[PDB]
Design a protein around this ligand. Structure first.
Ligand code: ADP
Ligand code: ADP
Ligand code: VO4
Ligand code: VO4
Ligand code: MG
Ligand code: MG
Lengths: 589, 589
């Protein structure tokens, strides 16, 4: 199909690079080795003919091409024929393997580079645990398929060419017709069975992927199932999915088998018809002069790839589907594309203004209806209010994760839409909604703030976050492995790692999502004071509905149902008897 | 080796079940089909002999076994020979495929059932993202290997048996010796190359697994890399790992190739030696009576599996290693094993006492040094203090996730060590440290409290958690997909889902890890009041260093560095000027 053509074109483009002529040299050498090996294979039965007819003569020598006396040397060379055939087949794989592995490396490189380019609207909801499975299966699929494609499929047509070349001796005058008819009928039957089996297999792969997703989700949420003693429930669900895959595979496997019977009988008759015509001519052309052996031989060397084609068909219908799935991954469109006239941003001072911004995560429901406020340079603002009002969304747009529906965003009198992403993102620092850590050292995960920083910068950074007091009690200094998702550490430790990451970068704009979420009063008061003198540039935004941590901020904004309701400093805001007054009089108690 | 023997024994035990004699019937039928097909294959060249010698006679008939006139019918039956060989080979796969898929289902069943049985000390730190990869690769490995094992390896020895049976005609009197020598030398060479390549491949698989782990960790922490603009860093690290795997594969692949040359030359000489001895006897025994054709034929049918053995060797050395890795997963020991005299627990009232408990997560560092307190039945306790004092550990032991080093745990005058796990775990309910949700509906994830509950119980449960107010604003009622880890919801929503899960179960013992972590003052005050009248049995434990949420609890305990320092009710505790007084006077401000 056209999709297969595009896949082949992309594969050929990735394989063939014009920078290095040494690659073309390798390809030409591999082709030469293939041609030599197949020529030797065709030569084998032809040279075996002289042994047979010489024995028939023994039962003079018209041909002078013979330089021997006893046919034993002929049989020695007959063995040497397959020896050399293997030898030339040997060197072909060695040359092609390097370029095959280079292609694998380049493809995996491109896929990994491309995946992080996509948007949160993909990676947040349409990331079903198993993109790793797709990449792993496809990467293994590519090497197998291209290794299969060159090593056995390509030489088969060339052997067909030589068996169609055997007509020069007046033998194959019809054998060419029979072989062409058999090949065409076999190809038609194979494609018909293949389309039918793809029709019956589309349900198989769909069922298979869901079971792995269920298993990976069960592994990820192991704590909950251990809490609620419901292991049998995931057990039964995985059983049902596996039974569905069982039925799908069993139905297909019997039908996949039937092709092997069809392939064998068609080509058995092809050899049978070759026997019949050879039997018809009782005259000397095709009786007892060896041509029966080559016809048994040469058309059987065409039957050598028959063993591959029937046997490897099970994975061909499976891996190629996974190939298209993984290649389909390299055609998605980045939702957030920078403007054509991309221009870097330079700020004399961080001033942020909203001009009636509207955003909806889904088109039907609009979370926020009108937001307009200004962030003075040299000061800071706090965002407090009831939950569910999208107050972490308001800081998910300044980083251009999503694009607003109808509104304007201004930083230092510059358009966020117009400015470059790299200048935008590297100038503003954030602490995430739920802290996530790498599977490496705590020192590496705290040094991630600026990858070119020094150890003393890291050590002084931990002093600002006041974690050396806990560090001195470490069992391993700056080397405790923190697990898969920072689980090994505590809540306060996980939250204090992210803050140190932000301070190490020391960005121009601060963006705090959770401050003092899981910290005691003494630590949080120290962090806030440590976050005022240092670690905070002249612009910073806090979203924290704890009242004591929004005391220090210059401006307080109240968000309810997406409308920015009440504004003002703390002293006036308490006397207004607004939502802020209700919230504060409760926490103060 | 012995490990291979144990793997084979386990595989045979899983495959062979004695409950159903129909399985034994299927196995016997498959063996009969195999024997018939191979007998037909051996018959092919033997019946082809009569065609050759009859033509030599044409160049009377001593044997009366012939019932034909023209050799065309002999050639028709000659084609029918491979037709029937394929036909019997056809039915063998159909019968064996069902039991193969049943074995796959049972093995995956057992692995999934066994994985959730292990402990947190495994699933929390030694779970490197990729257990799913191991299971997926092994499950695919089993079907391929056992499909290969029966279909081609087993018939090869049987063809060796018949080619050693051809001696009855005084032909193979030495051919048996040559074939046995060739087989033995080939096996010795194959095992030597295989052990060398396993030595060179142990580094390959080790390098391969690390790259996939890096990729999966990068995918999991996508938000952090997007925050910090360090995509090139993971790019370079994945490049380095892929280069290491590249070198490991390239070094092995050239050496893996060399075996194919060695296998071919040894068996080419075996056929060559068969030619030589046949050439020595110019007398009628082995000249121009067809035996050259069978010797070319019969020993080549032994060379039919040669094509498999060389070609499929690449995955045999790979999948079998993955087989052992996945089977090694079903031998780990559960760290927490219930006592032999397992007895269910029945509580008249929840009374919890600690008797000088000591626990260390790692042997070197002891987090807590002596904990002893009593939980009165009908009342509740609050655990407040500075972070890092293991206050979520103190509730990770009542659920018997780990075992204490030196101490006693008592519930209603019963030993936690002695009582049964299922009675223990199903009687106490907990809310997790970091909320984790399934990849299903919000209704399913809130109904997970009691899987046999009704919708009205779920709907009234959401009323207790006061989430219908947000539910009425849902875009889809009780059906919004919540993503991979509940990411699509907000923090307050994620925390309020877990609480509803706990209330739906309505356990005998309440165990709250984070209460009002990401909730405003108005919601938290409502939840606490909604958690006093209902949803709380007579025993409950709160760990929350927020002062306003520990006001209602009867008893307050202060934990610092693992020592339970200060105890007492709120009114007396404030006047003691302890750590609690310092913490409260700050939050109150
Ligand atoms: N990925 C998403 N898909 C659909 N709705 C979302 C998504 N992320 C957030 N929301 C909606 O936004 C509201 C709150 O947004 P957010 O700022 O993320 O949480 P919070 O307001 O607690 O900070 C919620 O009511 C939720 O329905
Ligand atoms: N899996 C683990 N491996 C090593 N140490 C741990 C692990 N889990 C917890 N700890 C240690 O326990 C202390 C706090 O325990 P925990 O109760 O989990 O957190 P918190 O005290 O914040 O509730 C931390 O100092 C941490 O070093
Ligand atoms: O659930 V919140 O609106 O406090 O991020
Ligand atoms: O970091 V904590 O000791 O408040 O769970
Ligand atoms: Mg904690
Ligand atoms: Mg939130």
């Amino acid at each position: 199909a056209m999709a297969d053509m595009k896949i082949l074109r992309t594969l050929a483009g990735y394989l063939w690079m014009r920078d290095n002529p040494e690659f073309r040299f390798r390809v030409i050498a591999a082709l030469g080795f293939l041609v030599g090996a197949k020529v030797l294979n065709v030569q084998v039965p032809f040279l075996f003919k002289l042994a047979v007819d010489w024995l028939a003569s023994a039962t003079t020598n018209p041909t002078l091409l013979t330089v021997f006396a006893t046919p034993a040397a002929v049989l020695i060379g007959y063995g040497i024929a397959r020896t050399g055939s293997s030898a030339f087949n040997e060197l072909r794989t060695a040359v092609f393997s390097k370029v095959a592995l280079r292609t694998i490396r380049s493809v995996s490189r491109k896929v990994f580079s491309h995946l992080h380019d996509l948007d949160l609207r993909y990676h947040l909801s349409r990331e079903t645990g198993g993109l790793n499975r797709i990449i792993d299966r496809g990467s293994r699929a590519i090497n197998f398929i291209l290794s299969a494609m060159v090593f056995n499929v390509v030489p088969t047509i060339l052997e067909i060419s030589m068996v169609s070349g055997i007509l020069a001796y007046k033998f194959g005058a019809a054998f060419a017709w029979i072989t062409s008819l058999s090949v065409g009928s076999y190809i038609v039957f194979t494609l018909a069975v293949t389309q039918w089996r793809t029709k019956f297999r589309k349900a198989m792969n769909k069922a298979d992927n869901d079971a792995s997703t269920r298993a990976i989700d069960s592994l990820i949420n192991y704590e909950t199932v251990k809490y609620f003693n419901n292991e049998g429930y995931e057990a039964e669900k995985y059983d049902q999915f596996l039974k569905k895959y069982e039925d799908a595979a069993l139905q297909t496997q019997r039908s996949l088998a039937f092709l092997n019977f069809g392939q064998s009988i068609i080509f058995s008759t092809a050899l049978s018809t070759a026997m019949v015509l050879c039997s018809q001519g009782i005259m000397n052309g095709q009786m007892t002069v060896g041509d029966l052996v080559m016809v048994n031989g040469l058309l059987f060397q065409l039957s050598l790839p028959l063993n591959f084609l029937g046997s490897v068909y099970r994975e061909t219908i499976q891996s190629l589907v996974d190939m298209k799935s993984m290649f389909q991954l390299l055609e998605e469109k980045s939702d957030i594309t920078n403007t054509s006239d991309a221009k870097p941003l330079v700020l004399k001072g961080g001033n942020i203004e909203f001009e009636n911004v509207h955003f909806s995560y889904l088109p039907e429901r609009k979370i926020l209806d009108g937001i307009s406020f200004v962030v003075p340079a040299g000061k800071s603002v706090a965002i407090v209010g009831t939950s569910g009002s999208g107050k972490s969304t308001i800081l998910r747009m300044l980083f251009r994760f999503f694009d607003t529906d109808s509104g304007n965003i201004r930083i230092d009198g510059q358009d966020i839409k117009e400015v470059r992403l790299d200048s935008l993102r590297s100038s503003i620092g954030v602490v995430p909604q739920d802290t996530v850590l790498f599977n490496d050292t705590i020192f590496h995960n705290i040094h991630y703030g600026r990858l070119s920083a020094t150890e003393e910068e890291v050590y002084e950074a931990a002093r600002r976050a006041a974690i050396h007091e806990t560090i001195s009690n470490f069992p391993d200094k700056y080397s405790t492995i923190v697990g898969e998702r920072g689980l090994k550490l505590s809540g306060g430790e996980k939250q204090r790692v992210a803050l140190a990451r932000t301070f190490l970068k020391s960005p121009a704009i601060l963006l705090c999502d959770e401050a003092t979420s899981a910290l005691d009063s003494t630590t949080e008061a120290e962090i806030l004071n440590a976050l005022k003198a240092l670690a905070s540039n002249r612009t910073s935004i806090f979203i924290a509905h704890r009242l004591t941590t929004a005391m220090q901020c210059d401006e307080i904004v109240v968000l309810e149902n997406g409308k920015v309701v009440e504004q003002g400093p703390h002293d006036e805001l308490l006397g207004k008897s607004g939502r802020y007054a209700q919230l504060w009089t409760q926490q103060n108690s």
